[PDB]
Every structure is written in structure tokens, then in C-alpha cells.
Write an enzyme that holds these catalytic residues in place. Structure first.
Site, short mmCIF file in Angstrom:
data_model
loop_
_atom_site.label_atom_id
_atom_site.label_comp_id
_atom_site.label_asym_id
_atom_site.label_seq_id
_atom_site.Cartn_x
_atom_site.Cartn_y
_atom_site.Cartn_z
N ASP A 26 -73.58 -78.98 44.58
CA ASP A 26 -73.45 -79.73 43.41
C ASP A 26 -74.44 -79.24 42.89
OD1 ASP A 26 -72.14 -81.31 41.56
OD2 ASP A 26 -72.94 -82.99 42.86
N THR A 27 -72.70 -78.54 42.27
CA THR A 27 -73.29 -77.21 40.65
C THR A 27 -73.82 -77.92 39.35
OG1 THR A 27 -71.66 -76.22 40.23
CG2 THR A 27 -72.66 -74.74 41.61
N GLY A 28 -72.55 -79.59 39.63
CA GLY A 28 -72.39 -80.15 37.94
C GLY A 28 -73.63 -81.30 38.57
#
Ligand SMILES: CC(C)CN(C[C@@H](O)[C@H](Cc1ccccc1)NC(=O)O[C@H]1CO[C@H]2OCC[C@H]21)S(=O)(=O)c1ccc(N)cc1
Lengths: 99, 99
Positions: A25-27
Site C-alpha cells: 500500500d503506497t498510500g
């Protein structure tokens, strides 16, 4: 590996001697698991997302294996609807976005 | 480009004739903006994240430019704390994870 995004980028994790699946999850700044049992001391922490905030336990200096790669860092424990690997761990395994 | 994850992967967007910044978010199925004004019909939709759910407006077939790349798709509008580009758009621009 390389992972495309036609499906949720879910990988296999080992953490606290337990096996789980989690979303790359880059967010997410932080890494958070529901229902794992981690040893030792922790501090309460409030996290904000879509829909409001969540109370979690914060554990520091926790070893994790992420799709076969070793990292150590903060792991949050609390009622997330899906386990997430965040940037605090992704940087350690050399994860990048590419387009 | 390639983007590393030492900082939040924020890029410049053009959507509905307006300029915004948004987080490249592999953990988001959907793309959601706070405070943009999109034309035409929409349907109410509830979205779930960390901390609970959020009511949004769903707009379909919306053109977007993401760091200079063209896509068209569903864009949700509602009170997200940060604008997010999700997998529905990321697949169109050929975005991948790599480690
Ligand atoms: C599996 C979920 C977590 C998906 N979320 C995307 C996630 O990347 C966002 C991205 C994001 C970022 C900020 C605020 C809200 C959402 N949230 C996030 O909650 O991260 C939290 C964990 O670490 C902290 O760092 C960022 C917020 C904390 S989500 O925002 O709820 C979401 C869910 C569905 C869609 N379509 C769009 C977004």
C-alpha cells in the site's frame, strides 16, 4: 518481483512468527495488521484514514518478512479491514512505483 | 517515471479542467478527490476505509491526466483527507510495483 495492479497487490508476510497476507500500500505511511499477537510493550496511537480515525497499538522494531524480503520497523495493530504494508517497510525492501 | 517511497508518492493531476495533487495509492481500488467540481450526473456511494465509511459522489467516464499520462474512469468525490489515485486509473497508465 514486479507486480501489476489489475488485482489488489497482496503478498505473503511472516510477522511475530505468524503468517498473513497483506496489501502493498503506497498510500499508507504505516504498516497495520488486524488480529496478530505481537510480543512486548506497545503504545496507544490514533490513525486517520478514509471514514475517520482508528485506535491502534503501536509496536516498534518488529521483524517482518514481506514476500521473502526482511525488514524491521513499526507495526500497528488494530481493526483495519485489510492488512497493509506501508512505506515505512516498503522502503526497506526497495519497493518502487514505475510507469 | 520511477518513484521511490521515502516520501509520499504525490503527483500532479488535471481533472475536470482543475489542477490538483494526489497520492499514487496501490491500496485504493478507486480514485477519490476532495473538493473538485465535476460535470454531469452522479450516484451516491459509500466507501470503506480505515476508521469506517464515507459517503461519496460517483462520477463515471471522467478524463484525467496523471503526471502527464491520459486515463478515463470512475472518480469519486467526497471528504478524503488526501486525494488518491487508485488502481482503476493506475492500470491505465501502466503503473507497476517493483522490488
Ligand atoms: C485498504 C485501504 C486502506 C484503502 N485506502 C487507501 C489507503 O492507501 C489510504 C490513503 C489515505 C491516506 C491518508 C488519508 C486517508 C487515506 N489510507 C490510509 O488509511 O493510510 C493510513 C495508514 O497509514 C497512514 O498513512 C496515511 C493514512 C494512514 S482508502 O483510502 O480507505 C480507500 C479505499 C478505497 C478507495 N477507493 C480509495 C481509498
Amino acid at each position: 518481483p514486479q507486480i501489476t495492479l489489475w488485482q489488489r497487490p497482496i503478498v505473503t508476510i511472516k510477522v511475530g512468527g505468524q503468517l498473513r497476507e497483506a496489501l502493498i500500500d503506497t498510500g499508507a505511511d504505516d504498516t497495520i495488521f488486524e488480529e496478530i499477537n505481537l510480543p512486548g510493550r506497545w503504545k496507544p496511537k490514533l490513525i486517520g484514514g478514509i471514514g475517520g480515525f482508528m485506535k491502534v497499538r503501536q509496536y516498534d522494531q518488529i521483524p517482518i518478512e514481506i514476500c521473502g524480503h526482511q525488514a524491521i520497523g513499526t507495526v500497528l495493530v488494530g481493526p483495519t479491514p485489510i492488512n497493509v504494508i506501508g512505506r515505512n517497510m516498503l522502503t526497506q525492501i526497495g519497493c518502487t512505483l514505475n510507469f
